[PDB]
Design a protein around this ligand. Structure first.
Ligand SMILES: *C(=N)[C@H](C[C@@H]1CCNC1=O)NC(=O)[C@@H]1[C@@H]2[C@H](CN1C(=O)[C@@H](NC(=O)C(F)(F)F)C(C)(C)C)C2(C)C
Ligand SMILES: *C(=N)[C@H](C[C@@H]1CCNC1=O)NC(=O)[C@@H]1[C@@H]2[C@H](CN1C(=O)[C@@H](NC(=O)C(F)(F)F)C(C)(C)C)C2(C)C
Lengths: 305, 305
């Protein structure tokens, strides 16, 4: 028993992190086979970042201008190209620690582990949700760019995020590993705003299932609802619409607990209308939306890698 | 910016986890050089666990009765002994992935990363505090025993916890790597109770410093207090006494923010007496006590390994 925010074990990603330096600018890169992937703003001076022309900056760079270090070892750069907002540095050495991997673009509402890194060295691991406004609530300082987000499925690392920048209210924005931003953000040092987030309804329901599995059952009521009536009532509390796809992915938790999804929706409706009356759910005084249905099943049935 | 519950990168510990099976019973072991350390209840049938005589069970075991697997590879057991509540299995192969390591006994109020494991395979990593009642709020299922807790200091893994059991209200108990329990618990399947926990005052103060560093400052008042008056007022809220040792370890955060420790204590006194008046601190509606002063500094200044 017990329910904790849990990250994937980071080892498979730790063996892929390198340091990339171009002139004055240093950040992290991800070394897979004989390619290093890193944020393209490595080629920028702090002045260039205010209004960069990356194509123009990159013409005036050579292979040798990129210093790539795997611990103490320099990796020789033998080619370079830009794909959207990421640089690809071909190196003369394949990373012997390359795991089986895929690049995936995650959907809003889905979670991943972040391995926060500085100077090519891992510092910490935590779990994030891709918010509906295409930001993450991370923890990143100067030098963190090129830190990656990932999921692990048995032996296979699905890389989904590379860190680029911090917005107002300390939230974070970045790209997939093809260099395409999540959300309407650009890699330019100019004021940008996230704009309005929403509560991930399916994840709140997943976490209420987690709570029941752990013996927290006070919020279960005797009622059901229609999907229609639930979505009508929940809209005013800035909850995203619950779709039949969402109901389908809750099926395993519904089946395991013998609580129909629309019965749990009736309990959620009462929490939204009445509040928690000074009670906690899994130790929290607020409804939690950063656990997916898969996150609940994996932890409350012990999947390994 | 941003402040997240963050675990140490797990790779150095992932390369030490093996599966140990004795007859019918399987759990995890930690392979360092040519020794495997695991909970001694691996030698028990479920019936033996009700009232075990471990010394008697172990006499009737041979080296070959211990099946140790590192992924697919069986490690030959060439010797065995019991130290308190852990078994030590000497194997014929030194673990080539053994990190620099130490065994440490952690103090109540200190944190560590847990690598939850099943069948010798890592599943997840999370952060725990050793509670003042010598339990941890973990997430552990059947087969999790032998999962370890640790801290990483540059290259050096300090192992501090090995998992043995689950108590009432889903809290967890275990040993140091010399097999000595934290708290008054025994490895016997009979009802045992944790008894009353306390709030780790120095960690609540560390987290209020984290909040200020992140721009959450509404709770800062114009007052100071004496250590004496603070401890008198806080006692009724089941906060542990704040000692001069605790004030000393807050010094770096105090120095960094320019907020004296007793000024923050005056702010904490007002939160305890008045509540949060419907406000949050770093997104929480409750005061958080599972971040050490070191945890705040490391995250809010980016230490790597
Ligand atoms: C990469 N190492 C950093 C990561 C930042 C630093 C503080 N916390 C983080 O997550 N990335 C940057 O410094 C990027 C980089 C120029 C400016 N920048 C920003 O993150 C800035 N934010 C923005 O410009 C904004 F608002 F648009 F998001 C900053 C004010 C420094 C936080 C580039 C090329 C975008
Ligand atoms: C090791 N793999 C498990 C870990 C447990 C299983 C459920 N969650 C956990 O953390 N350890 C055990 O099963 C130990 C083991 C016998 C019984 N046991 C317990 O954890 C039990 N608890 C207690 O006996 C109590 F209350 F004293 F802590 C159980 C009821 C199964 C949770 C031994 C030898 C103690």
């Amino acid at each position: 028993s017990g329910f904790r925010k849990m990250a994937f074990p980071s080892g498979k990603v730790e063996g892929c992190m390198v340091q990339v330096t171009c002139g004055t600018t240093t950040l992290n890169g991800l070394w897979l086979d004989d390619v290093v992937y890193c944020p393209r703003h490595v080629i920028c001076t702090s002045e260039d970042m205010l209004n960069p022309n990356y194509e123009d900056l990159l013409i005036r760079k050579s292979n040798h201008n990129f210093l790539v270090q795997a611990g103490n070892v320099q990796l020789r750069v033998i080619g370079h190209s830009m794909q959207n907002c990421v640089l690809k540095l071909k190196v003369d050495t394949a990373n012997p620690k390359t795991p089986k991997y895929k690049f995936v673009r995650i959907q809003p509402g889905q979670t991943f582990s972040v391995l926060a890194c500085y100077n090519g060295s891992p510092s910490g691991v935590y779990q994030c949700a891709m918010r509906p406004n295409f930001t993450i609530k991370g923890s990143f300082l100067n030098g963190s760019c090129g830190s990656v987000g990932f999921n692990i499925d048995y032996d296979c690392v699905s890389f989904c995020y590379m860190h680029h920048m911090e917005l107002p209210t300390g939230v974070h924005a970045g790209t997939d590993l093809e260099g395409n931003f999540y959300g309407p953000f650009v890699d330019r040092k100019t004021a940008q705003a996230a704009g309005t987030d929403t509560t991930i309804t399916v994840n709140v329901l997943a976490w209420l299932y987690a709570a029941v599995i752990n013996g927290d059952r006070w919020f279960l009521n005797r009622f059901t609802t229609t999907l229609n009536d639930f979505n009508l009532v929940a809209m005013k509390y800035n909850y995203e619409p619950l779709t039949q796809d969402h109901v389908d992915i809750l099926g395993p938790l519904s089946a395991q607990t013998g609580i129909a999804v629309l019965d749990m929706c009736a309990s959620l409706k009462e929490l939204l209308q009445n509040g928690m009356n000074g009670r906690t759910i899994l130790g929290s005084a607020l409804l939690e939306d950063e656990f997916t249905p898969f996150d609940v099943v994996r932890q409350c049935s012990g999947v390994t890698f």
